[PDB]
Amino acid sequence: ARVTLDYGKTGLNVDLPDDRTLPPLTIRPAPPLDDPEAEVVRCLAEPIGSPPLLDLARGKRSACILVCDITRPVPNPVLLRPILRTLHAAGLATQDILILVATGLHRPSTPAEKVEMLSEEIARTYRVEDHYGTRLEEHTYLGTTPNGVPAWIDSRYVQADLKIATGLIEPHLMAGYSGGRKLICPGIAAFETVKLWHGPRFLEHPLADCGFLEGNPVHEENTRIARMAGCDFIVNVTLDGARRITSVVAGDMEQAFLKGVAFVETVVKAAVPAPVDVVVTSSAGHPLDLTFYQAVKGLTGALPIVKPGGTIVIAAALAEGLGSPEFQSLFEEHPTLEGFMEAILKEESFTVDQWQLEELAKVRRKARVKFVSDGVPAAVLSRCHVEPVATVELAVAQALEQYGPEARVAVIPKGPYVLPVVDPT
Ligand SMILES: *C(=S)c1cc(C(=O)S)c[n+]([C@@H]2O[C@H](COP(=O)(O)O)[C@@H](O)[C@H]2O)c1
Ligand code: NI
């Protein structure tokens, strides 16, 4: 059974045993939009739950447009050219318009990344700046939620007369789905906010997980925080496995987002009849699989269909390596995941990116992990609570020998962009 797993910029061609392997779990077919940019134009004229963007923008003196950073494969020019043309038609000059990269707590985008994200012409024609989550002085305090999270949001967005956000609706291991409100919290929120919102009091709950909005405390809270900042207009898209846009939603930050989620829920779920002992997955290739930090998403994404004590085999290119210095420091400070969890469950201290180690700890309570990558040497991966294995085919052979002849293999080529589920019926 030959399959191409997502892997860096290339894919990875794997051959899995026919007798042991279930049919691959894939996004359901939906027709790509032939001309998604023209659809964005139409949706800006007739949006969901808001005035047309042209009428909203007229008389506004300044605009701030939130865009995702490199880790999200948003086809930004498709969304931005319509927005920028409408703002021009509304009378805003280009100098009135700021594009703000909603990094969350990620490192800033590089000059080359801005070109990759936005296109060269857009990137040199409008001001493009990065959010810095550890610079509290660049944020404005908006209040504290009923659950005690202070809302600190980037001042360039707070001060803008017209607030716009763009993004991509995909499953997310903490917030259920990306998009909508998440461009604000945490996209332009300070560590003072994010350290609490990404704390164990949120992440240890079972529905802080892929595909859950209802019942997910993470989503309740980032929606509440985004409502405190406000957002006048969003444009969000969904993408199929080949990265073609399959839907566009525009308008009210909540109503448009929920319509996009309703769409993605019709295609993202891939069901199996029972969990299996071996799950082969990816980190969705470039650009998500740049770091081990992000590749944890492939591991959490596989959890619903792995049996307790099973093995997840993941392939990810890891072209940028492990991730932030702070994320890397946690492995040095806590040799075992149990000890790491004891430390963070005390709430005495907060470290940038600790939330992803908390998610890796959740994976490792349920499953072994075999990790296939050339971006990081085996000795380095072995210190990150995964077993480096030279090839996916070898890793699967090893797991099948360990579990015995009844074991089955599932495979998820697009990794965390699929929502695998067990349907016992
Ligand atoms: C979601 S919890 C999230 C977390 C971070 C952290 O650093 S923590 C960063 N981001 C970035 O915010 C933008 C919007 O997120 P979405 O999940 O794509 O809707 C995007 O640039 C993310 O990289 C998000
Ligand atoms: Ni986050």
Distance between Cα 187 and ligand 1 center (Å): 5
The residue among 205, 207, 257, 211 whose CA lies nearest residue 231 is: 257
Distance CA 122, CA 102 (A): 17
CB 241 within 8 A of CB 256: no
Q: Where in the chain is the domain with CATH 3.40.50.11440?
A: 36-265
The residue among 5, 114, 67, 72 whose CA lies nearest residue 290 is: 72
- Identify the residue whose C-alpha is closest to ligand 1 atom 21: 68
C-beta 175 within 6 A of ligand 1: yes
Q: Where in the chain is the domain with CATH 3.90.226.30?
A: 2-26+268-422
Find the radius of gyration of the CA atoms of the chain.
21
Distance CA 185, CA 102 (A): 9
The residue among 327, 273, 285, 307 whose CA lies nearest residue 403 is: 307
The residue among 306, 421, 293, 288 whose CA lies nearest residue 363 is: 306
CB 162 within 8 A of CB 63: yes
Distance between Cα 104 and ligand 2 center (Å): 6
Residue 106 assigned ligand-binding role: yes
Class (C level, CATH) for 36-265: alpha beta
Backbone torsions φ then ψ of 315, nearest 5 degrees: -110, 130
The residue among 384, 30, 317, 361 whose CA lies nearest residue 173 is: 361
Taking each helix axis as running N to C, give the angle between helix 325-333 and helix 354-366, from 0 to 180 degrees, rounded to the nearest 10.
Answer: 50
Bridge partners, residue 289, by sequence: none
Residue 398 assigned ligand-binding role: no
Distance CA 411, CA 174 (A): 22
C-beta 172 within 6 A of ligand 1: yes
CB 203 within 8 A of CB 358: yes
Give me the helices (H) in 30-105, please: 36-45, 53-57, 76-89
Q: Which of 106, 198, 219, 334 is catalytic?
A: 106
CB 14 within 8 A of CB 3: yes
C-beta 181 within 6 A of ligand 1: no
Give the SS3 label for residue 156: helix
**Domain 2-26+268-422 CATH superfamily:** LarA, C-terminal domain (3.90.226.30)
- Which residue has tokens 């992440």? 203
Q: Which of 88, 131, 139, 172 is catalytic?
A: 172
Distance CA 102, CA 118 (A): 13
Q: Is the peptide bond before 32 cis (omega within 30 degrees of 0)?
A: no
Distance between Cα 186 and ligand 1 center (Å): 6
Distance CA 71, CA 418 (A): 17
Residue 88 assigned ligand-binding role: no
Terminal-to-terminal C-alpha distance of the chain: 26
* Reported resolution, Å: 1.4
- Catalytic-residue membership of 172: yes
CB 216 within 8 A of CB 181: no
Bridge partners, residue 5, by sequence: 12
